[PDB]
Design a protein around this ligand. Structure first.
Ligand SMILES: CC(=O)N[C@@H]1[C@@H](O)[C@H](O)[C@@H](CO)O[C@H]1O
Ligand SMILES: *[C@@H]1O[C@H](CO)[C@@H](O)[C@H](O)[C@H]1NC(C)=O
Ligand SMILES: *[C@@H]1O[C@H](CO)[C@@H](O)[C@H](O)[C@H]1NC(C)=O
Ligand SMILES: *[C@@H]1O[C@H](CO)[C@@H](O)[C@H](O)[C@H]1NC(C)=O
Lengths: 282, 147, 99, 344, 49, 49
C-alpha cells in the first residue's frame, strides 16, 4: 500500500554561491581556468521543502515529484536515520528505467531498474528485539521490479555523526547531472557551524562518483526513511515518530564560470559570468 | 617541438623560419642598440666624489646606495619593486638556469614551449652603473661632458 | 603609494607577457585539426594521412607566429621611436638644457 | 654553412639548438591485465537492426587486438581519427562499440557527419566522430534463400535524429483527421520498412555487419590499454615514456604535489602535462623535458684564425657532454680540446 | 553575420578576436590620446574678451 | 562546414590585413600627431627657432 507520510511545505530561500564542483578529473593549481558547464547560478531560488516526516495524518499525497531540468542541486541536514537516498527517472514507472540510490548505514547501493512504486517512496526501518537486525522487504514497500540492469556497491555517502552539531554538518550537497554519457554525482560534508540553511562562504563539491550511464532525467525525488527510536511500536501514530525531514532543491543552468584552484589543486573560488555587469567584467 | 616529421614538412614550406629568426635577431640587437644609444652616451665611467655635498641639493635618493649589494638608488629600488620582475639567468642547477616545482612556473612553461628571453647585454647592475656615470657627469661636470 | 605612477613600463611588460601568453594559447588552438598536441596526432595517424592535419596545424601556428612577429615589429618600431625620443631627451635635457 | 660564405667575419652567430637526446624508452601501464571483451563482439551470433543499433561498453581491459591480428578478413578498417596500426600505442577510456547490419553500398551514408535518410532517421553519426568503422560481409549467416526480411529500418520520422541518438517510438505521424488503423494512404505513412534483402540481389545489396568503435581520448582516466610490455621508470634521466598513450620525452622526478585521489594529470599555466600518476603504483611524478638551448659560435675573422668558442645559452654546465666535446670526438685542435676551459 | 553556426567554428581559431579587438581598442584610445595631447594642452578654458 | 571554414579564413585574413594596415597608418597618424603636439607646444605655445 502507498501512504504519504510527509508534511511537505514549500518556502523560497537564496542559493548564494553553493553548488560548485569539479568539471573534469584533471589536476590544476594556481590557475584561473574558465569553463562552460551546467551549474547552480549565483543568487537563485531554492525550493526549501520544509517538512515533518512520520505524520500519519497526511495519508493523502501532498508532495509532487520535482522535475530534473538541467541538473538538480540538493542540500539537507538529515542523517541516514531520516533521509536514505534519491530517485531519478523520466516517467518513474516500469516503462522507463528508474535509478534508485540507497544509503545504508554500512554501505551504498545504486541500482537501475524498472521499479514500480507510487509517488510516495520511503523506507521503514526498525531493529525489533526478535533478531536485533531487521531487513527491509522490496516486495512490501515496492510493488514490482523488472529487468534490473545496473548494480553498484560502495561505502556510505553519509558518514553521519551522532552529535547534533554533526547532524547539522551533514550538508549532503549531491549535485546530479547527466552530460556526455556521464551521470556525475558530487558530494560534500562541511564541519561548518550550525545555522538555518546553506551558509555564506564557498565549498567545492568533489566528484563522488561518475556513473557511466548519463541518460536524461525528467523528474527528481528524495528518498526518506521514517526515523524511529528503535523501541517504538509498529503501525501506529506512536510508531513512526515525527521528524523534520527538510530538504532543499535547486536547478542547474548552462553557464560560463571562472574558477580559482588553490595550491592543493582544489577549487577555492568561483564566479558566474552573467550574474551582473561586474560578473561579466570579471 | 621535438618531432622530426613536422620539421621535415616545415622545410618543404621554404624559409619562413629563417626570416623570422633574422627578424627577431634584428629586434634583439635593436634592443641592445637602444640601450647603448640611450645610456652608453659616454666613453668613461665617472665616479661620484666620496663626500657627497653639493650646496644642499640632496641626491641621496637618486645616487647609488653603498649599503645594499644592488648599489641602486632608493628611487631605483622603488622602481624595481613596483614593476613586475623578470628572469635574469640565476644559477640554480635546474637545467634551465632558474626554475622551481609548484611555483611561479610561467617562465619555465614558456621556456619549455620554445619561447625564450635572452638577457640584455648590459646587466641591470651595469645599466645602473651607466646611469650612475651619467648622473655623476650631470652633477659634477654639467653639460660639458656630452660634447 | 599610487599604483598607476609606473603605468607605461608596466604596460610594456604586460604587452610582452600577453603576447607570449597568446602565443602559448595558440598551441591549444586546433585551427581545424583533429587535435592540438603534435605527439597525440603523430601517435594517432600515420604520416600519409597525418600530413594534412599536421600541415593545417603548421599553417595555423605559422600564421600565429607571423602575426606575432609583425606586431612585434610594429611595437618595436614604436619602442624604437620612444628610444630615439629618450636618446634625444638625454642629449637635450640630461646632457644639456633644451628650450 | 649558415652564413652561406667561405669568409666569416668577427662576431657571434646563432648557429643551432642543442637538445640532450633521450637515453631509453620506458612504457607503462596498470599492473592489472585482462582480456578485453572485443572477442565477444566478434563472437556475437547477431547484431541489432540499424534503427535499434546495439551498443556495448568496453572499459577496464587491455586492448588485445589479436582478433584482428590473426583472423581479420574484414573489407574496410576505415579508421578516421586514428591509424589502424597505431592502436597498440594508445590507450582509450569508455570505449563504445555500436553494431548493426546494413547494406554494403550504404557505407558512404555512414561517413562521419554524412547526411542521408538513414543518417537522419535511423542513426546519425557525429560530425566530429573520432573512431573507426569495421565492415565485413555477413551473407554467410545473415542472409536467407527466402529473403532475410527480419531486419527492419525506420524509414521516416517527424524530425532528424540527433547524433548518437536512438529512438524506438513507433507512434504514427497522422497528418489529418483520418485514423491510420494500419492503412497506408492519405496522411498515413508507416515509419518502418523491412530490408530489401532479396536473394537475387548481388553483393553490396547483401547484408554486411558494421561495427562502429567510438573512443574518447585521454581526457578521462584510461581504462582500455595496449598490450605493450610494461617496464620500469628512472628519475633525473631524460627518457622516452608512453604513459597510457601519453607519449613524451624527459625526466620523471619524484613530485611533492598533493594530488586529489580522483586526479590523474596535473597541468601548469601553459596547460601541458607537468605531473602524472604512475598507472601501476598510484604515485605522482613530475615530468620535466631534458635540457636544451641555443648554441652560438664566437669566432674572429676566418681571415685571422680558425679556433672557435661555443656558447650554450641558458643551460647548466652539467649538460655539456654531447658529441662536439673532445671527450666525445677525436682530439683535434681545430675547434677545442683538453676538457677544461668551461666557464659558467 | 547573425549566425551561431559560423560562431561555433569561429571560436575554434582561438583568441585572435581578443587580439584584434584589443588592437582596435588601443587604436581608439590612442586617437583619444592624440586629440587630448594636440588640443588639451591646458586645463583652463579662456573666454574671448 | 568546409566552405564556411574557407570563407572564415578568407575574411579573417582580410580583417587581419585591415587591422595591420590600420596599425601602420595609425603609427603614421601617431607620428603626425606627435609632430602636431610638438608644433602646438613650440609654434602655438611658443616661438620655435
Ligand atoms: C531570496 C530570493 O532569491 N528570493 C526569491 C524571490 O525574490 C522571488 O520573488 C521568488 C519567486 O517565487 O523566489 C525566491
Ligand atoms: C528489459 O528492457 C527492455 C528495453 O530494451 C524493456 O522493453 C523490457 O520491458 C525490460 N524487461 C523485460 C522483461 O524484457
Ligand atoms: C594546502 O597546501 C598547504 C601548503 O601550500 C598546506 O599547508 C595545507 O595543509 C594544504 N591543505 C590541505 C587540506 O591539504
Ligand atoms: C667643500 O665641500 C665639502 C664636501 O665636498 C663640504 O663638506 C665642505 O663644507 C665644503 N666647504 C665649503 C663649502 O667651504
Amino acid at each position: 500500500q502507498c501512504v504519504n507520510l510527509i508534511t511537505r511545505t514549500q518556502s523560497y530561500t537564496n542559493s548564494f554561491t553553493r553548488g560548485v564542483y569539479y568539471p573534469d578529473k584533471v589536476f590544476r593549481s594556481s590557475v584561473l581556468h574558465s569553463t562552460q558547464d551546467l551549474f547552480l547560478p549565483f543568487f537563485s531560488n531554492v525550493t526549501w521543502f520544509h517538512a515533518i516526516s512520520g505524520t500519519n495524518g497526511t495519508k493523502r499525497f501532498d508532495n509532487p515529484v520535482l522535475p530534473f531540468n538541467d541538473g538538480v542541486y540538493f542540500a539537507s541536514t538529515e542523517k541516514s536515520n531520516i533521509i536514505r537516498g534519491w530517485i531519478f527517472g523520466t516517467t518513474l514507472d516500469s516503462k522507463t528505467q528508474s535509478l534508485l540510490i540507497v544509503n545504508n548505514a554500512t554501505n551504498v547501493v545504486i541500482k537501475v531498474c524498472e521499479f514500480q512504486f507510487c509517488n510516495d517512496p520511503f523506507l521503514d526501518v526498525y531493529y525489533h528485539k526478535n533478531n536485533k537486525s531487521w531487513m527491509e522487504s522490496e516486495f512490501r514497500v515496492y510493488s514490482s521490479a523488472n529487468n534490473c540492469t545496473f548494480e553498484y556497491v560502495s561505502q556510505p555517502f553519509l558518514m553521519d555523526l551522532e552529535g547534533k552539531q554533526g547532524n547539522f554538518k551533514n550538508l549532503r550537497e549531491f549535485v546530479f547531472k547527466n552530460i556526455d554519457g556521464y551521470f556525475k554525482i558530487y558530494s560534500k560534508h562541511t564541519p561548518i557551524n550550525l545555522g538555518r540553511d546553506l551558509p555564506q562562504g564557498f565549498s567545492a563539491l568533489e566528484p563522488l562518483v561518475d556513473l557511466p550511464i548519463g541518460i536524461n532525467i525528467t523528474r527528481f525525488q528524495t528518498l526518506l526513511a521514517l526515523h524511529r527510536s528503535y523501541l517504538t511500536p509498529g503501525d501506529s501514530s506512536s510508531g513512526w515518530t515525527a521528524g523534520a525531514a527538510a530538504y532543499y532543491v535547486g536547478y542547474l543552468q548552462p553557464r560560463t564560470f571562472l574558477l580559482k584552484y588553490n595550491e592543493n589543486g582544489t577549487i577555492t573560488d568561483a564566479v558566474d559570468c552573467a550574474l551582473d555587469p561586474l560578473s561579466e567584467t570579471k | 617541438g621535438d618531432s622530426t616529421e613536422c620539421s621535415n614538412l616545415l622545410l618543404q614550406y621554404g624559409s619562413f623560419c629563417t626570416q623570422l629568426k633574422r627578424a627577431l635577431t634584428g629586434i634583439a640587437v635593436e634592443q641592445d642598440k637602444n640601450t647603448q644609444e640611450v645610456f652608453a652616451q659616454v666613453k668613461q665611467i665617472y665616479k661620484t666624489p666620496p663626500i657627497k655635498y653639493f650646496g644642499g641639493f640632496n641626491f641621496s635618493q637618486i645616487l647609488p646606495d653603498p649599503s645594499k649589494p644592488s648599489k641602486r638608488s632608493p628611487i631605483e629600488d622603488l622602481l624595481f619593486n613596483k614593476v613586475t620582475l623578470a628572469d635574469a639567468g640565476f644559477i640554480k642547477q635546474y637545467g634551465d638556469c632558474l626554475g622551481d616545482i609548484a611555483a611561479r612556473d610561467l617562465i619555465c612553461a614558456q621556456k619549455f614551449k620554445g619561447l625564450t628571453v635572452l638577457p640584455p647585454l648590459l646587466t641591470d647592475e651595469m645599466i645602473a652603473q651607466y646611469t650612475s656615470a651619467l648622473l655623476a657627469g650631470t652633477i659634477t661636470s654639467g653639460w660639458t661632458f656630452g660634447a | 603609494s599610487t599604483p598607476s605612477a609606473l603605468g607605461k613600463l608596466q604596460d610594456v611588460v604586460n604587452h610582452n607577457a600577453q603576447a607570449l601568453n597568446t602565443l602559448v594559447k595558440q598551441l591549444s588552438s586546433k585551427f581545424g585539426a583533429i587535435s592540438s598536441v603534435l605527439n597525440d596526432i603523430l601517435s594517432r595517424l600515420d604520416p600519409p594521412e597525418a600530413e594534412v592535419q599536421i600541415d593545417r596545424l603548421i599553417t595555423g601556428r605559422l600564421q600565429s607566429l607571423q602575426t606575432y612577429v609583425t606586431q612585434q615589429l610594429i611595437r618595436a618600431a614604436e619602442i624604437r621611436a620612444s628610444a630615439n625620443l629618450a636618446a634625444t631627451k638625454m642629449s637635450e635635457c640630461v646632457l644639456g638644457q633644451s628650450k | 654553412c649558415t652564413l652561406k660564405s667561405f669568409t666569416v667575419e668577427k662576431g657571434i652567430y646563432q648557429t643551432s639548438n642543442f637538445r640532450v637526446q633521450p637515453t631509453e624508452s620506458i612504457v607503462r601501464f596498470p599492473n592489472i591485465t585482462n582480456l578485453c571483451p572485443f572477442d565477444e563482439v566478434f563472437n556475437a551470433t547477431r547484431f541489432a537492426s540499424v534503427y535499434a543499433w546495439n551498443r556495448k561498453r568496453i572499459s577496464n581491459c587491455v586492448a588485445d587486438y589479436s582478433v584482428l591480428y590473426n583472423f581479420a578478413p574484414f573489407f574496410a578498417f576505415k579508421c578516421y581519427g586514428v591509424s589502424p596500426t597505431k592502436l597498440n600505442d594508445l590507450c582509450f577510456t569508455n570505449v563504445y562499440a555500436d553494431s548493426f547490419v546494413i547494406r554494403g553500398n550504404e557505407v558512404s551514408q555512414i561517413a562521419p557527419g554524412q547526411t542521408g535518410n538513414i543518417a537522419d532517421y535511423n542513426y546519425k553519426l557525429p560530425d566530429d566522430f573520432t573512431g573507426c568503422v569495421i565492415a565485413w560481409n555477413s551473407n554467410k549467416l545473415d542472409s536467407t534463400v527466402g529473403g532475410n526480411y527480419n531486419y527492419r529500418y525506420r524509414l521516416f520520422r517527424k524530425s532528424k535524429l540527433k547524433p548518437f541518438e536512438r529512438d524506438i517510438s513507433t507512434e504514427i505521424y497522422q497528418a489529418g483527421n483520418k485514423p491510420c488503423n494500419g492503412v497506408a494512404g492519405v496522411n498515413c505513412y508507416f515509419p518502418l520498412q523491412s530490408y530489401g534483402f532479396r536473394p537475387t540481389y548481388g553483393v553490396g545489396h547483401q547484408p554486411y555487419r558494421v561495427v562502429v568503435l567510438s573512443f574518447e581520448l585521454l581526457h578521462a582516466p584510461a581504462t582500455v590499454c595496449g598490450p605493450k610490455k610494461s617496464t620500469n621508470l628512472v628519475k633525473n634521466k631524460c627518457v622516452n615514456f608512453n604513459f597510457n598513450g601519453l607519449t613524451g620525452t624527459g625526466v620523471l622526478t619524484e613530485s611533492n604535489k598533493k594530488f586529489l585521489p580522483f586526479q590523474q594529470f596535473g597541468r601548469d599555466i601553459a596547460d601541458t602535462t607537468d605531473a602524472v600518476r604512475d598507472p601501476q603504483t598510484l604515485e605522482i611524478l613530475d615530468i620535466t623535458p631534458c635540457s636544451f638551448g641555443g648554441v652560438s659560435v664566437i669566432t674572429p675573422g676566418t681571415n685571422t684564425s680558425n679556433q672557435v668558442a661555443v656558447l650554450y645559452q641558458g643551460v647548466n654546465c652539467t649538460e655539456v657532454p654531447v658529441a662536439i666535446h673532445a671527450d666525445q670526438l677525436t682530439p683535434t685542435w681545430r675547434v677545442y680540446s683538453t676538457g677544461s676551459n668551461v666557464f659558467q
